[PDB]
Amino acid sequence: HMSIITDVYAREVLDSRGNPTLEVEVYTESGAFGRGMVPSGASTGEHEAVELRDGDKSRYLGLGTQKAVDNVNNIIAEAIIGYDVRDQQAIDRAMIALDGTPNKGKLGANAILGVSIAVARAAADYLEVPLYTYLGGFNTKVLPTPMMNIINGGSHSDAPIAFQEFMIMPVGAPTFKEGLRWGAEVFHALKKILKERGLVTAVGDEGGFAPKFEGTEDGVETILKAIEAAGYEAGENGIMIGFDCASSEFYDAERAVYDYTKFEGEGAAVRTSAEQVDYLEELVNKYPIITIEDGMDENDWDGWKVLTERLGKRVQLVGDDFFVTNTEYLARGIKENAANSILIKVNQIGTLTETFEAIEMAKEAGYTAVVSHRSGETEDSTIADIAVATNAGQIKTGSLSRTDRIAKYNQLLRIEDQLGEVAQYKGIKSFYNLAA
Amino acid sequence: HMSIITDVYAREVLDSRGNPTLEVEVYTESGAFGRGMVPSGASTGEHEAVELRDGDKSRYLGLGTQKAVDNVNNIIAEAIIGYDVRDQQAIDRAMIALDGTPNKGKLGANAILGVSIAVARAAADYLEVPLYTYLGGFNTKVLPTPMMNIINGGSHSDAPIAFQEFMIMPVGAPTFKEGLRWGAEVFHALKKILKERGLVTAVGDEGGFAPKFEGTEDGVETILKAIEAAGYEAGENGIMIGFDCASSEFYDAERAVYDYTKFEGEGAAVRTSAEQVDYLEELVNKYPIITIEDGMDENDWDGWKVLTERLGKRVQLVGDDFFVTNTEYLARGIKENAANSILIKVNQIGTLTETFEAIEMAKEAGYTAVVSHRSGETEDSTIADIAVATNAGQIKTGSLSRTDRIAKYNQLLRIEDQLGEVAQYKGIKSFYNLAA
Amino acid sequence: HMSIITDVYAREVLDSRGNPTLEVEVYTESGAFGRGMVPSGASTGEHEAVELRDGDKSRYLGLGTQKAVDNVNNIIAEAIIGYDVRDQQAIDRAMIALDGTPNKGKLGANAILGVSIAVARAAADYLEVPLYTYLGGFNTKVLPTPMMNIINGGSHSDAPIAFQEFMIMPVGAPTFKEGLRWGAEVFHALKKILKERGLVTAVGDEGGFAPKFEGTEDGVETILKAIEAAGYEAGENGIMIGFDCASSEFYDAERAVYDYTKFEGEGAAVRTSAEQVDYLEELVNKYPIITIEDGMDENDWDGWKVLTERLGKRVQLVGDDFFVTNTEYLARGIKENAANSILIKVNQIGTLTETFEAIEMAKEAGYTAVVSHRSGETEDSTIADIAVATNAGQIKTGSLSRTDRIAKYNQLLRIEDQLGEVAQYKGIKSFYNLAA
Amino acid sequence: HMSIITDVYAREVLDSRGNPTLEVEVYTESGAFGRGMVPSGASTGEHEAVELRDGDKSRYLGLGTQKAVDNVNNIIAEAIIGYDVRDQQAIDRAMIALDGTPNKGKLGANAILGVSIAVARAAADYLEVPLYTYLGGFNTKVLPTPMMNIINGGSHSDAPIAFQEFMIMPVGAPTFKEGLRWGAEVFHALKKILKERGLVTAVGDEGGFAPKFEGTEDGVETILKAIEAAGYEAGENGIMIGFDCASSEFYDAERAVYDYTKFEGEGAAVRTSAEQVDYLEELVNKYPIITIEDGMDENDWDGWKVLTERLGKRVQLVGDDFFVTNTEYLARGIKENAANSILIKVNQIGTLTETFEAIEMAKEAGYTAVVSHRSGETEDSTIADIAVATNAGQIKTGSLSRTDRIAKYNQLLRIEDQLGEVAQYKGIKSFYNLAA
Fold first, then answer.
1. In which pathway does it act (chains A, B, C, D)?
2. Measured between beta carbons, which residues in chain B are less than 8 angstroms from residue C202?
């Protein structure tokens, strides 16, 4: 009986930003093993799975996770011992039934996810195969195109800019190894230009800068200056820009209006939904933009319909906080024509079995699906293997600065060395949701 | 060095219908073993992958396969010995480069497919896992809806009926084991109705009847009397009908017209491409039709555009000889919006790697893909693994009579038993390309 | 304890013709395994072993086999676990004693046979030897001469012919690989001659044609036309004809006479037992015939004595429905001089232990023994290994058309490749029961 | 021959801050595996061990590491293949001889350190034991006291403060798990105090803040308000402060004076070496200071004698750029009585053998030794094993923010859990060089 799960064990550790999180470890009878640990983040009263936190105001200001360590050791390990390590779907279905709630309130999504990743790593170690081959079978080959954060704004800095972050994509590169170099050389050309102007070059929670720019037009024109000073083109032969909003944050839920005078001054505009579509069309007609994210409110389905009619032929319109990784809303989004892409976060839904079902339901509609980080990342690297295992073609893994971010880029350089001449980089041909 | 391929060896054997085919065996240094053998077919006048056959007029009327087994033993074997059995994509790309011709005509597509199936079955045996889990990774679980042929016509009979075969689908069934039972219990009621009328009940190459009916309306109304007599009901709540209209056999390109006087009597109607879409629309309004295959000629691109615009929300429009399992033609079909599904034949393309690439491209475009039999079949059951490894949701495998056909329905009964409570049968929900 | 039987398991599957049958499976403690599944057929009130069938008029018209799956899983498997996989004779003796009835009525012959074949395949896999070597020891080498069905009559077609089927035997061939080619080329010369005449070329349950021939004289003379048109000789240097009757079907049990006016018209003859022997002698003196089967009634022992005195020097007189694979009647047949050969069917008697005892009791009397198919065959191949394991020299495995038949011919081509220069084909010297 | 090294292989990858570094992998004949990758740095104008970098101005601004990975693959690999994986000291002495240059400048110290770490991690995996037990033998048990950076100054900020960084030590804590908690709970109270004052709270390369304070007294009094606000107390009964005075950045050797007007305003004082020891003495009397690093210039030997005479019983005087991890200079520092501690940097010297020799010499002289990070770090955690393998009792690993820093604090939480009741945390008892 060499493949049986012999025991399961959990402990409390720290994430980037320095708050408590779990680590879980699994062993088989032959002595093969796997470690899984969870990135941090939660919500309550929303349509999302719940973290369990201790609430002790005397330890870590209430953010401790001993209450979730007791569930793994006293309850989940008692039920899971004696299964075969390769029965992934029967194990995940057994935990979801053991909990017995829709929000995962009793066991918490942090306990259930940490186990689910540990079992997959033990099984790939036992068979002696790479984790992208265990997850995806023999037909895995496409290296994702990265979208790289460089400047922040909105609620994440004191600068007079409304949108939450700006990105670059190296869509013209020949291979992932040259595509990563082009992003590094542009980051080391932008740092000099902020230093010359006498602005702040200290980094935020994703490794991008947060300098006091005088407005969105100078925020974008300075990025076009860094791209040229590094020596590369802008447009579909070179590098392209993207945006990421949080249109939830300035939508007035009583006046039904986009009041920009929250993050910009009293001199800023106030816009109804048809005028917000006109403002995004003015930007897309002016700059080398290829993607926009959460440009409309979480509950304003009428805006999402009008926006997708106007721009959905030319640009990737991602929904994130609109769908919350949930198949009960991706179904209605496909039915009512509400977007042309989705953003996937494994800890919003809380198992590998429920994750891989949403990725394929998106693909069969023609929607591109993108895997992504949380704020409190760890030294774990699994989302780079999910991106190559599903041939998904795009990844959102943060800026070129901190090891909590650089650990994923260094993993994709190991995979592209293993695959040899089988590996493919699609560049601009990865946007299959546009003009097909 | 336990995983290494240590020899590969080939021999000549008979298929059903009693013509020469080919069989290959592969062994590793551990002593793990896999066998694969090729289904029989070629088509003359277009660039499918090409079989190699012997020249001598004497043996087997010139259908012998000695040159193909000489190529596996004398050319492919010395090249593939020394690879790891798990290098599927590097082995497939090595044979294609060794041959070096677009239609595979120098070594023959019968040699290259035989080797490619043997290696995949040696590797899944070496790891001790099912072939669907080896090909598909941890997330395989949907049992396909079957299309069951039950009547022939057209060129395959001396009856005056224009279309080549007629089918049933058990779309309303709870589970694959009940869907297979309903198919058998209708077939045993139709056989009784033909004996009462005094028509013949012997069977053709596909295991279905070919009786001398008066016309296509008497064919379809005879099927509805069998569905009523076995105890079920027609439409999406029970059983649905479908057609294979092999429409290239009765198009005339010197007058540019669909001429029924090739198979119908001298009173028969003659239809230009507008009158042909009007005819299929007239049938779909009168009977419970769900799928129409190949309804317009191979090169009638304007006909395919017009047909798909008229019918495409109601009915599945499968293309067969229109695309010939080729990504060069499936690209144009997507771009032009010419059809809403594809049918896959593994030996038209000639490797397992290129087969899984074509399924993925169709799926991203929002098409279904249907995996299928040939006429000359063997005791092999590999397509029942490919239909589950890709979660494709549909299969065409023939009527309920002969073990060239039944061996696939019996392999799906083993897979549905290994999966237990984790298996799914979608039924009418399998048509994700419809009902938008 | 590596060779112990660890567990036994059974499921319901379909046969050729599409009715339910069992499959049974066995594993040892080292993980060697074997699968066995049963061909269909039964009788009641006759001197033959009984199948168990569910009798549910609401499932498969009463032909279901769940009642026999419960016996394998709840009773037979409980008794057999913990035996050594190699104790075949002790295992078969234990099941026969556990049942406790002469007709095998309580457990059913389908449950008991399926187990018995599974254990033999597990044991040959554990030792790592071919199944003919496990069954027969080191002295196995003679490839059987095949008798191949081509035309059918009697109860099996509407044509005016009394005898149930006609056969060809390639007795002049140098090797089994040339002996199979000569049969294939004559089948593909006969198919053209039926199209030329405008007769039906659709196949029946054994892969032979059933066309409306005008009488037995044209049925045999057309076969002599196909043999010449393929280019070969008729007689002991080439190909020879055989017949198979069912003289049970037209023997009048009250008038004590063979009334041919059942299947032939009102103008046919009516013959008493000495006149039937005269009629068979007129056929044998006219055509190149070498074998006849069931030419007299099942109970007309006086007819069988007279017939064997008249013709038993020149022709092989097979008893089939006369002996019913039963040693209590083969004893009386040897005592009273009643035939010169026997037909063997493993599912009439119902174990491998009771099968191999009757084959040797026949051989020691100078009778030839022949192994054969049922109507509802499966993708199983075991009867080809029984034929080479007993050096029996003859096989009755059906026509050159369906995979339920071609699977046995393709297995004998694998055995003759394994045996190399040790293999022998006896041709006409295999009839040791004539002129010795 | 199971223990033998069978290949070694190297590749290029990014560090944190996003510059090129190097990674090495080693395999044995048993298939045991070890990976090691190098932290980034060099210093210009003195004989540390030397890195090798590429010449091309274009790629990565000339910081590429292709020549270093060519040397591992083409020169070191053919020499180290065939050794036993446990011959650590013979392997280390072979690379040093093969290079043959005092500063390691022909192969580069980046190549030689990568191979030396990979080999030690393959050997601890082959024996199946923890790395601290492999390096240290059976008597490893002391968890080190951490030095936690929390504010920057000097060259690393645009604030007018002279010293380069400020720290806290949790000297009064019961256990390492409480000592790590007190560090994080002060950091989250300082972050709130900076937001109230309106100063920036983005982070530098070491994960600590760099706010625009008025002067060094406002820095130290801001830290004391955080220690009071989190709930603890200052001095040996709770938390203590320490400095890194990078005093070589503001010494002038053409006037022979410590000139504060390099970083302080034009009103700043100018101090000769006697006035500089009087300044440090004035700080140590006013606040709870325990450690002073690098307080006099690299060549101010008379300053170091006078400083160590004045302060050496009260305070730890760490030397960093004074000794450069070199036994030729540490010998003179001992003999001439110049300082009372050393700080160890593994890539200043270039092997694990020479690193353990320098720790031993310091320990016998009655000095402490402190193991330390560089600025360009990686996901590796090896220094958390070297601090326990030598029972050293102190470590400098950075602030509580980024996983280039947190990955070491998380590894010491695993080690403290494996040891159980056998582990010790010394706290204020760790300063064995003081309180004589």
1. Carbohydrate degradation; glycolysis; pyruvate from D-glyceraldehyde 3-phosphate: step 4/5
2. 200, 202-204, 210
Asked if residue A363 lies in contact with residue B363, where contact means CB atoms within 8 angstroms, the answer is yes
Integer Cα distance of A302 and A338 in angstroms: 9
Sheet holding A251-252: strands in order across? A251-252, A257-259, A270-271
User: In B136-253, where do the E strands start and end?
Assistant: 145-152, 165-169, 240-244, 251-252
Nearest to A4 by CA among A85, A88, A90: A85
Residue among D391, D373, D384, D375 nearest D415 (CA): D384
Helix (H) or strand (E) holding D394: strand D394-396
Q: Cβ of D337: how many Cβ atoms within 10 Å?
A: 12
Coil, strand, or helix at residue D179? helix
Q: How far apart are CA A426 and CA A407, in angstroms?
A: 23
Whether A351 and A95 have beta carbons less than 8 Å apart is answered as yes
A197, burial (CB in 10 Å: exposed 0-12, middle 13-18, buried 19+): exposed
Strands D240-244 and D289-293: parallel
Nearby residues of C215 by Cβ (< 8 Å), 6 or more positions away: C160, C161, C264
Contact C18/B59, CB-based, under 8 Å?
no
Residue contact C181–B404, C-beta within 8 A = no
- Nearest beta carbon to residue C13 from set B17, B185, B410: B410
Tokens matching residue A227: 């791209």
Q: Experimental method for this entry? A: cryo-EM
- CA–CA distances in Å: residue C393 to residues C69, C178, C389: 36, 16, 10
Distance CA C114, CA C20 (A): 14
Lay out the sheet containing D33-37: strands in order across.
D5-14, D20-28, D33-37
Burial of D269 (0-12, 13-18, 19+ CB in 10 A): exposed
Query: B270, B261 in Cβ contact below 8 A?
Result: yes
DSSP letter for each residue of C356-367: HHHHHHHHTTT-
Chains C and A touching, counted as 3 or more CB pairs less than 8 Å apart: no
Q: Between A120, A136, A364, which is nearest B363 by CB? A: A364
Residue the block writes with tokens 């989190």: D230
A16: nearest CB among D187, D188, D406: D406
Nearest CA to CA, how far is B391 from chain C (Å)? 23
Q: Which residues does chain B break after (C to N > 2.5 Å)? A: none
Q: How far apart are CA C40 and CA C375, in angstroms?
A: 7
The answer to whether B18 contacts C184, with C-beta atoms less than 8 Å apart, is yes
Q: Does A97 touch chain B (CB under 8 A)?
A: no
Sequence letter at residue A330: L
Short-list D266, D268, D269, D290, CA closest to D278? D269
Structure tokens at C135: 């069954």
Distance, in Å, from the CA atom of B17 to the CA atom of C400, rounded to the nearest integer, reads: 7
> Long-range contacts made by residues D303-310, C-beta under 8 angstroms, separation at least 24?
D303/D273, D303/D276, D303/D277, D304/D338, D304/D339, D305/D336, D305/D337, D305/D338, D306/D273, D306/D274, D306/D277, D307/D277, D307/D280, D308/D337, D308/D338, D308/D339, D308/D340, D310/D277, D310/D281
Q: Is D34 exposed, middle or buried (0-12, 13-18, 19+ CB in 10 A)?
A: buried
Angle CA D16–D19–D23, to nearest 5: 80
Residues 6+ apart with CB under 8 A from D202: A200, A202, A203, A204, A210, D209, D210
Closest-CA residue to A133 (of D11, B346, B123): B123
